[PDB]
């Protein structure tokens, strides 16, 4: 496992040190349909002429990014994405910029968001939630081993691929960092207490997040919810959580170690790192290697009657794309 990780690190480091830039242009693609909206910008299904390949293109308006004070986070997102490599991470195929916009061309993942299936079906069975949760575990282990904090886990950001496996998308809040950082970002339902309390935090906020996610998948609703974020924060910070009476006792014990407001004893943050989680009883039947190799059979395989069909995604208002004749925000995004 070490030689895996150790070698993963050397590869990321070389890419991180000298990122790829300008690997395409908007002309080489045809616009088909808007697939969704993430942290910032829009993502559209596109077709790559020269190859006939379908991709998902994230487009960000440079001026809007500057307005929201997201420049550094945006540069983070591309620099990190061009550098990582993992089965459960959506792959970035190219990136480029024009006078107006930043572009990030990613693998098209046709099964849609976990979000859509979860809400439609209600909640997942424990073995079902375990299969998903394992892939996130391995993914955070990869990411944290490179000093990366994900900071935006939610079912909206988890796509289901043709083999029924998960791919994580939207690195808008991802950051390579040693030790602590302070930005107030993420999704209210998923925020760790240390974050809402401006205490300063580290990668343990991600393991809390996995807690929220396992709960939401198993229950059909988040541990902390309410009409407004403000009420949501009061409940995250209060040291209390209720479990549906169908939750197995092991699952409850896991969740108690994950939604641990005490950084001291929060699972994932102890002496044994991720192994504390990997070894919990709830994961007793989880075959960590077979899952990394996708040899494990998925619970659910999405309807897919086209290489470029979009019915597993909701429809969105289709917004035109405007490319200035004048360059915008040149110096800000020079490294993009």
């Amino acid at each position: 496992v070490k030689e895996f990780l150790a070698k993963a690190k050397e590869d990321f480091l070389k890419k991180w040190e000298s990122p790829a830039q300008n690997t395409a242009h908007l002309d080489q693609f045809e616009r088909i349909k808007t697939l969704g909206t993430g942290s910032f910008g829009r993502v559209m299904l596109v077709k790559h002429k020269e190859t006939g390949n379908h991709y998902a293109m994230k487009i960000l308006d440079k001026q809007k990014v500057v307005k929201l004070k997201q420049i550094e986070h945006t540069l983070n997102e591309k620099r990190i994405l061009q550098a990582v490599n993992f089965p459960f991470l959506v792959k970035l195929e190219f990136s480029f910029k024009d006078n107006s916009n930043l572009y990030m061309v990613m693998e098209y993942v046709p099964g849609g968001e976990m979000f859509s299936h979860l809400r439609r079906i209600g909640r997942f069975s424990e073995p079902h939630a375990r299969f998903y949760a394992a892939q996130i575990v391995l993914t955070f282990e990869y990411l944290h081993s490179l000093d990366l904090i994900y900071r935006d886990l939610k079912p909206e950001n988890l796509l289901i691929d043709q083999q029924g496996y998960i791919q994580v998308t939207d690195f808008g809040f991802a950051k390579r960092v040693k030790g602590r950082t302070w930005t107030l970002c993420g999704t209210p339902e998923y925020l760790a207490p240390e974050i809402i309390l401006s205490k300063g935090y580290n990668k343990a906020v991600d393991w809390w997040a996995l807690g929220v996610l396992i709960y939401e998948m198993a229950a059909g609703y988040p541990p902390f919810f309410a009409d407004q974020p403000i009420q949501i924060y009061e409940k995250i910070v209060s040291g209390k959580v209720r479990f549906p009476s169908h939750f197995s006792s092991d699952l409850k014990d896991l969740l108690r170690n994950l939604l641990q407001v005490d950084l001291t004893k929060r699972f994932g943050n102890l002496k044994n790192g991720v192994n504390d989680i990997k070894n919990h009883k709830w994961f007793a039947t989880t075959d960590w290697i077979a899952i990394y190799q996708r040899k494990v059979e998925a619970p659910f395989i999405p309807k897919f009657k086209g290489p470029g069909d979009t019915s597993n995604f909701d429809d969105y208002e289709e917004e035109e794309i405007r490319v200035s004749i004048n360059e915008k925000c040149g110096k800000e995004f020079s490294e993009f």
Partner: peptide, 18 residues
């Protein structure tokens, strides 16, 4: 039920980041 409260709440859609 907690599920009934969630389903009638304003946060069963796609949730934006802060």
């Amino acid at each position: 039920t907690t599920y009934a409260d969630f389903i009638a709440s304003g946060r069963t859609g796609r949730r934006n980041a802060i």
